[PDB]
Design a protein around this ligand. Sequence first.
Ligand code: HEM
Ligand SMILES: *[C@@H]1O[C@H](CO)[C@@H](O[C@@H]2O[C@H](CO)[C@@H](O[C@@H]3O[C@H](CO)[C@@H](O)[C@H](O)[C@@H]3O)[C@H](O)[C@H]2NC(C)=O)[C@H](O)[C@H]1NC(C)=O
Ligand SMILES: *[C@@H]1O[C@H](CO)[C@@H](O[C@@H]2O[C@H](CO)[C@@H](O[C@H]3O[C@H](CO)[C@@H](O)[C@H](O)[C@@H]3O)[C@H](O)[C@H]2NC(C)=O)[C@H](O)[C@H]1NC(C)=O
Ligand SMILES: *[C@@H]1O[C@H](CO)[C@@H](O[C@@H]2O[C@H](CO)[C@@H](O[C@H]3O[C@H](CO)[C@@H](O)[C@H](O)[C@@H]3O)[C@H](O)[C@H]2NC(C)=O)[C@H](O)[C@H]1NC(C)=O
Ligand SMILES: *[C@@H]1O[C@H](CO)[C@@H](O[C@@H]2O[C@H](CO)[C@@H](O)[C@H](O)[C@H]2NC(C)=O)[C@H](O)[C@H]1NC(C)=O
Ligand SMILES: [Ca+2]
Length: 595
Amino acid sequence: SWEVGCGAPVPLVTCDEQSPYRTITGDCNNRRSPALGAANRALARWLPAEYEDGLAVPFGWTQRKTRNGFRVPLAREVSNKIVGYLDEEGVLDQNRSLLFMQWGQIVDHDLDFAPETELGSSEHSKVQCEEYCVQGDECFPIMFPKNDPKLKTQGKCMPFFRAGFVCPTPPYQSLARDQINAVTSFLDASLVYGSEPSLASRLRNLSSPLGLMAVNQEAWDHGLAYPPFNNVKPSPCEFINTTAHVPCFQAGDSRASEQILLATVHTLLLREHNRLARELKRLNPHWDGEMLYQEARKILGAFIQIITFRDYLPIVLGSEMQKWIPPYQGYNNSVDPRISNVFTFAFRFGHMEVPSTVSRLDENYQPWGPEAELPLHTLFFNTWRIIKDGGIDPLVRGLLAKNSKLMNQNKMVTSELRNKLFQPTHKVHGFDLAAINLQRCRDHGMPGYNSWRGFCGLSQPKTLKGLQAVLKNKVLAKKLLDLYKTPDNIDIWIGGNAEPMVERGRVGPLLACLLGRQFQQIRDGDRFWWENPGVFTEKQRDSLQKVSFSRLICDNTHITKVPLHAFQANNYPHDFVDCSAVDKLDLSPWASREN
Ligand code: HEM
Ligand SMILES: *[C@@H]1O[C@H](CO)[C@@H](O[C@@H]2O[C@H](CO)[C@@H](O[C@@H]3O[C@H](CO)[C@@H](O)[C@H](O)[C@@H]3O)[C@H](O)[C@H]2NC(C)=O)[C@H](O)[C@H]1NC(C)=O
Ligand SMILES: *[C@@H]1O[C@H](CO)[C@@H](O[C@@H]2O[C@H](CO)[C@@H](O[C@H]3O[C@H](CO)[C@@H](O)[C@H](O)[C@@H]3O)[C@H](O)[C@H]2NC(C)=O)[C@H](O)[C@H]1NC(C)=O
Ligand SMILES: *[C@@H]1O[C@H](CO)[C@@H](O[C@@H]2O[C@H](CO)[C@@H](O[C@H]3O[C@H](CO)[C@@H](O)[C@H](O)[C@@H]3O)[C@H](O)[C@H]2NC(C)=O)[C@H](O)[C@H]1NC(C)=O
Ligand SMILES: *[C@@H]1O[C@H](CO)[C@@H](O[C@@H]2O[C@H](CO)[C@@H](O)[C@H](O)[C@H]2NC(C)=O)[C@H](O)[C@H]1NC(C)=O
Ligand SMILES: [Ca+2]
């Protein structure tokens, strides 16, 4: 097979092995195979890639060719018939907050990214894709089926570009096509600190010896910080309201400004880096800026680890967790920490948890002003609503008080995501996230629903009656097969999502498995996982056990009323208490001494 080590990454990183700090790139975690889990390398393959030419060409590319003796259904046709719904009433999750959706997006963004193939600088390859919908090379258009209302308004297709691949980005051929993970595979708060040594520095305040991080100079949220602006024009954030002139935020992750609430938790995280950084110079005045940045970076890492695994995961995987993520037993140097290709489609389960509206509430948890409840589609790359319409305080209260959208077989993805999505480079408010997910499955060369079913050790449904038993839904299983013709061909995203949810959790049998395995691999294969003896001192761990997302809000906002359990559905005022009832993170054990 091979090549054994293709591609060019950040080709200049040799290990210190004696440093107690993670590399920005994620290198040097593993002593034996040191590029394992790093950034800018092939997503791991749990199962062999599936292309029609067996090498690189997606299923759906050529019209004459077929998948298992059937034509693959159009990306959007799958959506129009199965994914969409009209009536938004009763789709709310009665036992999970908007934060349950929100944190999903934070971890994931920490864990993976597969950068698009917008290669070029002054180009007509972008034009022949968008204007003419000409398939070929790095352009893979999402066509519109007969009687799509988007034909009248938008055109003949939705522009779609293939994902970036290993070795170089001009076509080529040898092994099957593997897609690139632009971020580090460890749960290491890279959304904040970056995955490139080049960018990791740009985000830092290297003007003072305090290990602080660059903050906005133009705007201020009641004396509290905002992220810096991305002064790289043209920007998507400016385009949406030209009169405002407000550009996107800049963090260690490109997707920080995609939606308004994701930029909000980005503000909270950046805020507590500086708070830890400041409290550490209170306690350790002799420390240089480097120790400060790094020591703060280490606590925040541990922060995102404890919240993800103690608070988030148990309510996602549910009864299935102990089956897949048993209790911790130490760092296994034989476990592959890399994020697999399929995982980048498993974690997308959350797209069906995004509700139609984002609300802004006041101190009394009452609707804030005339335009309190906004449509979500108006909030893609919307930063002017943060900076010039209340700050983050109203949006944070919304997260804690308002419900998440519950997954439903008859009501899947909101039309605000499935019909009105804004994509950063393009101009209109009209892409389909359901269709975009469905061709990326095909682009990445995913094997079908059944391979993955079997991979996890679950009955591989082959008949109409078979699929029924698994999906516990006769009408959905029939629509699925009328389009896919066989359950072997169902795209992993929709197939995995269609399944009913496990007990006490928010995902079904197949997804619990795929998600379950990854999260254990990235816990067990991480040399810097907080609990692993050596990383944090015995005392340091005891304080880290006390962190809560509620405390992140209290110490970095002028919200004073917070629920204790921030991922479950809480009502005002009964479930809300004072910030004083919420346990503080004691940073005393970090106090190093001299004589
Ligand atoms: C309104 C909120 C959200 C918006 C607007 C949004 C939008 C997007 C878009 C446009 C993509 C690119 C898809 C592609 O081209 O393949 C994406 C990727 C992704 N999203 Fe979301 N998303 C949201 C929330 C979430 C949440 C809450 C989660 C997790 C629970 C999530 C999980 C993911 C994952 C895993 C990817 C692929 C990551 C990778 O690059 O490998 N998203 N999102
Ligand atoms: C483009 O961005 C600007 C903000 O930079 C938006 O303009 C603002 O629009 C609202 C009206 O919807 C104005 O608020 C008004 O004043 C007070 C609150 O400050 C309130 O009592 C009034 O009832 C009213 O809501 C605000 O002054 C105005 N800013 C100015 C002077 O430009 C604009 O709506 C955005 N448009 C788009 C295309 O989204
Ligand atoms: C809504 O979700 C809440 C968050 O999980 C959940 O709170 C959970 O309540 C039970 C208390 O019993 C705990 O789960 C345990 O339940 C039984 C024990 O009687 C066992 O079978 C389970 O294995 C499990 O240990 C959770 O600890 C607790 N969650 C947390 C972390 O606070 C509510 O119960 C849910 N509300 C509804 C709709 O019932
Ligand atoms: C990099 O770090 C610098 C030092 O920590 C920081 O400069 C400080 O900025 C704050 C906030 O803008 C200023 O605090 C306040 O100054 C007066 C107080 O009398 C107020 O009237 C202002 O409203 C302001 O809030 C400090 O004056 C300033 N400190 C120093 C040492 O000059 C930079 O802003 C940081 N730069 C970046 C890009 O992150
Ligand atoms: C560390 O984890 C690895 C991977 O799960 C374990 O390696 C397995 O060892 C079994 C024997 O029990 C072998 O049959 C397999 O070859 C290994 N499995 C895999 C997935 O490769 C190992 O048991 C663990 N080691 C320690 C010390 O905990
Ligand atoms: Ca990471």
